[PDB]
Design an enzyme around this catalytic site. Sequence first.
Site, PDB file in Angstrom:
ATOM      1  N   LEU A  20     -51.354 -32.566   6.301  1.00  0.00           N
ATOM      2  CA  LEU A  20     -51.745 -31.258   5.793  1.00  0.00           C
ATOM      3  C   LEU A  20     -52.539 -31.338   4.501  1.00  0.00           C
ATOM      4  O   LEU A  20     -53.339 -30.445   4.221  1.00  0.00           O
ATOM      5  CB  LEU A  20     -50.501 -30.401   5.539  1.00  0.00           C
ATOM      6  N   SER A  22     -53.228 -34.237   0.752  1.00  0.00           N
ATOM      7  CA  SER A  22     -52.804 -35.377  -0.043  1.00  0.00           C
ATOM      8  C   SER A  22     -53.361 -35.180  -1.453  1.00  0.00           C
ATOM      9  O   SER A  22     -54.109 -34.235  -1.719  1.00  0.00           O
ATOM     10  CB  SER A  22     -53.274 -36.702   0.576  1.00  0.00           C
ATOM     11  N   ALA A  24     -52.585 -36.839  -5.841  1.00  0.00           N
ATOM     12  CA  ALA A  24     -52.150 -37.947  -6.679  1.00  0.00           C
ATOM     13  C   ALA A  24     -50.695 -38.318  -6.443  1.00  0.00           C
ATOM     14  O   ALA A  24     -50.329 -39.481  -6.627  1.00  0.00           O
ATOM     15  CB  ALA A  24     -52.357 -37.608  -8.158  1.00  0.00           C
ATOM     16  N   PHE A  25     -49.853 -37.352  -6.074  1.00  0.00           N
ATOM     17  CA  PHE A  25     -48.418 -37.568  -5.968  1.00  0.00           C
ATOM     18  C   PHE A  25     -47.936 -37.959  -4.574  1.00  0.00           C
ATOM     19  O   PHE A  25     -46.872 -38.581  -4.463  1.00  0.00           O
ATOM     20  CB  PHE A  25     -47.686 -36.357  -6.536  1.00  0.00           C
ATOM     21  N   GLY A  26     -48.672 -37.635  -3.521  1.00  0.00           N
ATOM     22  CA  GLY A  26     -48.251 -38.029  -2.192  1.00  0.00           C
ATOM     23  C   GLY A  26     -48.974 -37.258  -1.109  1.00  0.00           C
ATOM     24  O   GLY A  26     -49.878 -36.464  -1.367  1.00  0.00           O
ATOM     25  N   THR A  27     -48.553 -37.528   0.125  1.00  0.00           N
ATOM     26  CA  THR A  27     -49.143 -36.927   1.313  1.00  0.00           C
ATOM     27  C   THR A  27     -48.138 -35.988   1.959  1.00  0.00           C
ATOM     28  O   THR A  27     -46.975 -36.353   2.150  1.00  0.00           O
ATOM     29  CB  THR A  27     -49.569 -37.997   2.317  1.00  0.00           C
ATOM     30  N   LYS A  47     -43.250 -34.689   2.614  1.00  0.00           N
ATOM     31  CA  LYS A  47     -44.109 -35.300   1.608  1.00  0.00           C
ATOM     32  C   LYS A  47     -43.568 -36.690   1.313  1.00  0.00           C
ATOM     33  O   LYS A  47     -42.502 -36.835   0.705  1.00  0.00           O
ATOM     34  CB  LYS A  47     -44.186 -34.456   0.337  1.00  0.00           C
ATOM     35  N   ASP A 139     -48.612 -27.291 -12.962  1.00  0.00           N
ATOM     36  CA  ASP A 139     -49.705 -27.243 -11.989  1.00  0.00           C
ATOM     37  C   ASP A 139     -49.601 -25.999 -11.116  1.00  0.00           C
ATOM     38  O   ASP A 139     -49.713 -26.056  -9.889  1.00  0.00           O
ATOM     39  CB  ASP A 139     -49.738 -28.501 -11.124  1.00  0.00           C
ATOM     40  N   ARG A 143     -53.591 -22.771  -4.736  1.00  0.00           N
ATOM     41  CA  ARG A 143     -53.367 -23.836  -3.762  1.00  0.00           C
ATOM     42  C   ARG A 143     -51.907 -24.271  -3.697  1.00  0.00           C
ATOM     43  O   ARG A 143     -51.473 -24.805  -2.669  1.00  0.00           O
ATOM     44  CB  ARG A 143     -54.246 -25.031  -4.117  1.00  0.00           C
ATOM     45  N   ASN A 144     -51.140 -24.058  -4.768  1.00  0.00           N
ATOM     46  CA  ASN A 144     -49.741 -24.461  -4.839  1.00  0.00           C
ATOM     47  C   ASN A 144     -48.781 -23.288  -4.669  1.00  0.00           C
ATOM     48  O   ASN A 144     -47.649 -23.336  -5.161  1.00  0.00           O
ATOM     49  CB  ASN A 144     -49.467 -25.186  -6.156  1.00  0.00           C
ATOM     50  N   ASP A 157     -44.916 -27.694  -4.481  1.00  0.00           N
ATOM     51  CA  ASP A 157     -45.512 -28.945  -4.958  1.00  0.00           C
ATOM     52  C   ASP A 157     -44.639 -29.667  -5.973  1.00  0.00           C
ATOM     53  O   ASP A 157     -43.946 -30.628  -5.623  1.00  0.00           O
ATOM     54  CB  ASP A 157     -46.909 -28.727  -5.531  1.00  0.00           C
TER      55      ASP A 157
HETATM   56  C1  LIG Z   1     -53.844 -25.857   1.573  1.00  0.00           C
HETATM   57  C2  LIG Z   1     -53.239 -26.854   2.407  1.00  0.00           C
HETATM   58  C3  LIG Z   1     -51.966 -26.374   3.109  1.00  0.00           C
HETATM   59  O1  LIG Z   1     -52.121 -25.326   3.706  1.00  0.00           O
HETATM   60  N1  LIG Z   1     -50.719 -27.029   3.101  1.00  0.00           N
HETATM   61  C4  LIG Z   1     -49.439 -26.616   3.705  1.00  0.00           C
HETATM   62  C5  LIG Z   1     -48.331 -26.841   2.925  1.00  0.00           C
HETATM   63  C6  LIG Z   1     -46.943 -26.555   3.199  1.00  0.00           C
HETATM   64  C7  LIG Z   1     -45.827 -26.863   2.270  1.00  0.00           C
HETATM   65  N2  LIG Z   1     -46.204 -27.502   1.011  1.00  0.00           N
HETATM   66  C8  LIG Z   1     -45.464 -28.567   0.310  1.00  0.00           C
HETATM   67  C9  LIG Z   1     -45.649 -28.760  -1.065  1.00  0.00           C
HETATM   68  C10 LIG Z   1     -44.943 -29.746  -1.758  1.00  0.00           C
HETATM   69  C11 LIG Z   1     -44.034 -30.613  -1.150  1.00  0.00           C
HETATM   70  O2  LIG Z   1     -43.356 -31.518  -1.913  1.00  0.00           O
HETATM   71  C12 LIG Z   1     -42.197 -31.011  -2.529  1.00  0.00           C
HETATM   72  C13 LIG Z   1     -41.584 -31.734  -3.625  1.00  0.00           C
HETATM   73  C14 LIG Z   1     -40.439 -31.256  -4.262  1.00  0.00           C
HETATM   74  N3  LIG Z   1     -39.817 -30.015  -3.855  1.00  0.00           N
HETATM   75  N4  LIG Z   1     -38.676 -29.314  -4.314  1.00  0.00           N
HETATM   76  C15 LIG Z   1     -38.620 -28.201  -3.512  1.00  0.00           C
HETATM   77  N5  LIG Z   1     -39.650 -28.167  -2.590  1.00  0.00           N
HETATM   78  C16 LIG Z   1     -40.384 -29.299  -2.813  1.00  0.00           C
HETATM   79  C17 LIG Z   1     -41.573 -29.838  -2.184  1.00  0.00           C
HETATM   80  C18 LIG Z   1     -43.789 -30.477   0.227  1.00  0.00           C
HETATM   81  C19 LIG Z   1     -42.811 -31.348   1.025  1.00  0.00           C
HETATM   82  C20 LIG Z   1     -44.529 -29.469   0.904  1.00  0.00           C
HETATM   83  C21 LIG Z   1     -44.474 -26.538   2.612  1.00  0.00           C
HETATM   84  C22 LIG Z   1     -43.300 -26.776   1.785  1.00  0.00           C
HETATM   85  N6  LIG Z   1     -42.354 -26.969   1.125  1.00  0.00           N
HETATM   86  C23 LIG Z   1     -44.352 -25.913   3.912  1.00  0.00           C
HETATM   87  N7  LIG Z   1     -45.340 -25.642   4.741  1.00  0.00           N
HETATM   88  C24 LIG Z   1     -46.672 -25.944   4.435  1.00  0.00           C
HETATM   89  C25 LIG Z   1     -47.828 -25.659   5.327  1.00  0.00           C
HETATM   90  C26 LIG Z   1     -49.159 -25.954   5.024  1.00  0.00           C
HETATM   91  O3  LIG Z   1     -50.184 -25.671   5.900  1.00  0.00           O
HETATM   92  C27 LIG Z   1     -49.831 -25.238   7.232  1.00  0.00           C
HETATM   93  C28 LIG Z   1     -50.760 -24.166   7.846  1.00  0.00           C
HETATM   94  C29 LIG Z   1     -55.071 -26.485   0.932  1.00  0.00           C
HETATM   95  N8  LIG Z   1     -56.515 -25.709   0.757  1.00  0.00           N
HETATM   96  C30 LIG Z   1     -57.471 -26.942   1.123  1.00  0.00           C
HETATM   97  C31 LIG Z   1     -56.875 -25.389  -0.609  1.00  0.00           C
END
Ligand SMILES: */C(=C\C(=O)Nc1cc2c(Nc3ccc(Oc4ccn5ncnc5c4)c(C)c3)c(C#N)cnc2cc1OCC)CN(C)C
Length: 276
Positions: A20, A22, A24-27, A47, A139, A143-144, A157
């Site tokens: 979905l 990536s 600096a911190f991960g994918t 992630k 941050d 986007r976040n 994020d």
């Molecule tokens: C937009 C690209 C895009 O649409 N991405 C996503 C993202 C989705 C997420 N995001 C997510 C953020 C951070 C994560 O890491 C964490 C670290 C620590 N934490 N404590 C509590 N929660 C966290 C998260 C993770 C694992 C995921 C989530 C979530 N959570 C759920 N669903 C997402 C869907 C999605 O797209 C699907 C259509 C970029 N344009 C290019 C600007």
Amino acid sequence: PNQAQMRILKETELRKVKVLGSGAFGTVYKGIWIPDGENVKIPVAIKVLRENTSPKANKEILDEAYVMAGVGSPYVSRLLGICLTSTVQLVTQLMPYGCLLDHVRENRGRLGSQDLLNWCMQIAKGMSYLEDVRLVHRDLAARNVLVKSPNHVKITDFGLAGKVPIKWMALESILRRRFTHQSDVWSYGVTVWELMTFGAKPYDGIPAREIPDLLEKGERLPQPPICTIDVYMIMVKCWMIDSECRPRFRELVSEFSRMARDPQRFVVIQNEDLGP
Ligand SMILES: */C(=C\C(=O)Nc1cc2c(Nc3ccc(Oc4ccn5ncnc5c4)c(C)c3)c(C#N)cnc2cc1OCC)CN(C)C
């Protein structure tokens, strides 16, 4: 108190389906979680972090997990589980509508005044919770922020909860490397600017090196066409050089909830733009 539950996951009950994003911190992967030997499939985001600073970033990531494993605010994404491989993986519920930035970008002319004001209220509420649990996001950006449903958003994020996008950073963070909750309010102002501009790029075309001199010379992001000066004036407060001139998150909650109750007075969508 604090009976949250961290579900330590075996890697074999996780399927990475699609990348979905990536950075600096991960994918971040879109994927499916199947509880160990259970009959269900849950859409999840995973992630996987890196291998660098496995000695120190794991521990700061562990406490990010501790703070965001509690069912705290509905406007902050909650961590479902941790996969304790050599490279730590974080599993979490999938918000299906994606990240707010590209949601609002492809729904220009589909969002009214309450949808925009309601988000800013929720995002302020989510940040207000993070302020109460002593977390500085560093941050915050469009986007976040995630879209669970058309009228429900979550802050996410936290990889930064040098490598910070400079156009969302307060001036004192750029110069004095200092990050407070009041610098997050600056980030809050930019994020609201992104919403009210339907996902415009802040300081578009301006190189990042010129940003601090630009801000020190008194320039800020311009007034969005759909913003009344009431709404634009809140953003302007968030970009005061003096950090104690900026609004508090609990104040931003009250003001945007007041404007969300009468959205017609404060945001005028009829003004999407005009051609020259
Ligand atoms: C937009 C690209 C895009 O649409 N991405 C996503 C993202 C989705 C997420 N995001 C997510 C953020 C951070 C994560 O890491 C964490 C670290 C620590 N934490 N404590 C509590 N929660 C966290 C998260 C993770 C694992 C995921 C989530 C979530 N959570 C759920 N669903 C997402 C869907 C999605 O797209 C699907 C259509 C970029 N344009 C290019 C600007």
